[PDB]
């Protein structure tokens, strides 16, 4: 009956804080505030967070602390018919590990390359440069920080597509190995250590954000970047695309449906106030994004003033923001080597605690389903990370970015949405809100308010569908720069995107032919919760 528990309350919180906080809080968010009406964007963001995000963030956490088991077993016990939810969710977190950990590797490679008196990405007279190189971003040209990250670090120029991955960057394979070594000795003996490793990975970014906020705000032209960041424009409120961007970002920044919030909370005490944990964590997540926004744009404004570069050419999203745009600015300011070291170290610690939970979601949900590998945690996570590293060598290739970009757009993008959708429908309609409220009451003390109950069954499916429907609208064949992916790569992507949620009906169908009885007397069996004995 007894499983292990967090060796301290903060361990759990820092684990959930650490997972939820991501580089997406750095480059997805401050960009969205920029393009969708400044401070006015906080209104659809705030509302979508209140009625959509936090309710879902709460739900999975509550399920974790209640059913006390991983993603596969929790949904198997909740609703036997939709046990496939547990399966679809876990291997989603398995696919992500194939491309997400290469971001941390990039951050380490830059950290190792920052040990110098003159940063290598400042000049345009290097071995890797082209005549189209300029000291900073410009319309029609390339920058020094861009060609460094592209032609030297990635050597992406030597690739003609995903069909041609080229050679293997062993300086990159080393960094990837280093990452998996760190993720290894952190999750190897479980929450006893992983609940302590997060004390660094989830706290250091805030330390770095502090001294980057100070450095960023002392720069000349820092206040100008703040204006670009938060100058109100309530015309965006009328735009549904803004409400979509607000809804999307809110949902993807809290990250339910990875079975990690489910896994993490499953190590909590049964009578732990999980309601306070959900509200606290979700806020800090959104608050972290807000803080990071100042850090970026104070530096971004500094470039648009004392370096003479258009704000349109620096207000960038994606990895380009912190691998090209931001380091270029650091290179100009005094004590550049210092800011460069702590910035890339921040980026590394921003992904580790997220990767921890992503991997932990796998290990935990598998240990509760198959008792054999629970006694074999070390030997299992050995082969798992070895598989990650082996396949991860494809990410360390010259055309490794093309493989990374394919998985990024397919593996987690759509697979999550229709998985979390079935999560909300199962709990609120199949399982039912009235007995879910009964569980939470028995745990923390009080049944959820009418607000959370309405949000869980009416607002949540609409919210998720509203996001899913617009992501369908803005779809266009996978493209990066000039390179258009061949339609077999897109087909390959949809397979990886489909191999997840294909578990929902498949397991439902397979677990429907058993056990014996009429059609009506089997839906009853497969909707009967495990705790009716």
């Amino acid at each position, epitope marked *: 009956d007894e499983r292990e528990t967090w060796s301290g309350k903060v361990d759990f919180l820092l684990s959930v804080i650490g997972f939820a906080v991501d580089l997406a809080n750095v480059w997805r968010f401050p960009y969205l505030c920029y393009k969708n009406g400044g401070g006015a964007f906080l209104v659809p963001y705030g509302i979508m967070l209140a009625v959509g995000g936090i309710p879902l963030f709460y739900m999975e956490l509550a399920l974790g602390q209640h059913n006390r088991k991983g993603a596969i077993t929790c949904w198997g016990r909740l609703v036997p018919l939709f046990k496939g939810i547990g399966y679809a969710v876990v291997l989603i977190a398995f696919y992500v590990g194939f491309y997400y950990n290469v971001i941390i590797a990039w951050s380490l490679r830059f950290f190792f390359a920052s040990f110098t008196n003159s940063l290598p990405w400042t000049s345009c007279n290097n071995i890797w440069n082209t005549p189209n190189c300029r000291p900073f971003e410009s319309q029609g040209f390339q920058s020094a920080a861009s060609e460094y990250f592209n032609r030297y670090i990635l050597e992406l120029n030597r690739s003609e597509g995903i069909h041609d991955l080229g050679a293997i960057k062993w300086d990159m394979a080393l960094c990837l190995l280093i990452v998996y070594l760190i993720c290894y000795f952190s999750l190897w003996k479980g929450i006893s250590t992983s609940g302590k490793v997060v004390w660094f990975t989830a706290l250091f970014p805030y330390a770095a954000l502090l001294i980057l906020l100070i450095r960023g705000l002392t720069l000349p032209g820092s206040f100008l970047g703040i204006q670009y960041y938060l100058t109100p424009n309530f015309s965006a409120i009328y735009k549904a695309e803004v409400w979509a961007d607000a809804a999307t970002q809110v949902f993807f920044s809290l990250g339910p449906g990875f079975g990690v919030l489910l896994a993490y909370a499953s190590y909590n005490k049964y009578h732990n106030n999980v309601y306070k944990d959900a509200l606290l964590t979700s806020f800090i997540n959104s608050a972290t994004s807000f803080i990071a926004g100042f850090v970026i744009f104070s530096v971004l404004g500094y470039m648009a003033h004392t370096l003479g570069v258009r704000i349109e050419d620096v207000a960038t999203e994606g990895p380009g923001l912190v691998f090209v745009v931001y380091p270029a600015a650091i290179a100009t300011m005094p004590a550049s080597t210092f800011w460069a070291l702590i910035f890339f170290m921040m980026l590394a610690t921003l992904g580790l605690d997220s990767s921890f939970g992503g991997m932990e979601a796998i290990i935990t949900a598998l240990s509760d389903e198959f008792p054999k590998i629970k006694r074999n945690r070390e030997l299992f996570v050995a082969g798992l990370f070895s598989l990650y590293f082996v396949v991860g060598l494809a990410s360390c290739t010259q055309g490794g970015f093309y493989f990374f970009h394919l998985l990024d757009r397919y593996a987690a993008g759509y697979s999550i949405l229709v998985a979390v959708f079935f999560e909300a429908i199962a709990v609120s309609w199949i399982y039912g809100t*009235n*007995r879910f*409220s*009964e569980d939470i*009451r028995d745990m923390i*003390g009080f*049944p959820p308010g009418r607000y959370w109950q309405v949000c869980w069954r009416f607002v949540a499916p609409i919210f998720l569908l509203f996001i899913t429907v617009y992501l369908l609208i803005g779809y266009e064949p996978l493209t990066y720069a000039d390179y258009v992916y061949p339609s077999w790569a897109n087909a390959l992507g949809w397979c990886i995107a489909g191999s997840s949620v294909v578990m929902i009906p498949a397991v439902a169908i397979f677990k429907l032919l058993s056990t014996p009885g009429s059609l009506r007397q089997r839906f009853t069996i497969l909707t009967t919760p495990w*705790r009716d004995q």
Partner: antibody
Amino acid sequence: EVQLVESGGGLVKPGGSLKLSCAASGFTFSSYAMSWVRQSPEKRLEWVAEISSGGRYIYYSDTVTGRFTISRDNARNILHLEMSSLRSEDTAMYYCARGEVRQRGFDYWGQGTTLTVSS
Amino acid sequence: ENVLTQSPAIMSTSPGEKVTMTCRASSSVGSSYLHWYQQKSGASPKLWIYSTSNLASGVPARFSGSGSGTSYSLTISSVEAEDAATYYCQQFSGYPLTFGSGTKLEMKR
């Protein structure tokens, strides 16, 4: 609005069995965890059993457990308490309460039914 | 069990006085889990003060609550004749639930 009435109760000889009932009205009964609390003739309060809004989580006292069986009927809004192997200590005025929210306690108490267990 | 002890058992008081009844627990009790009940003679108890200090609905502002851990107390600022009853404190911290021994108010003459 909210009104709780306790039926059953009476004189029962030691070892006997009696079923107490509580008729609720004025609230969605299937949303409030009911609970039985008895009061000895020396006006001393003692908790007996709590039942959830769905009757899935049951809690008993140690002086009572093994003998009593609290029951719920959210359909007809009735709270039951089936007692067996009664002893003289069980002699009390049994009350019906609805402590759905723990951090608040029992907000409404019934009139109370009297049980005397004597030979 | 988490036995609650209230002192004092019978308390005499002329109207206007300020009275204080105490409730100490054998074990540490969460602050928001301790509640108070008033039971007038020949009547069922009533929720009087929930969550240590928060007065219940209908309870005059002359009542108050204070305490933490293993020591709580109910206090009536200015006693009126219609406050003559028996007051039970109750901890919700854990199961099994336990009521205090109760204190009895009696007016002076």
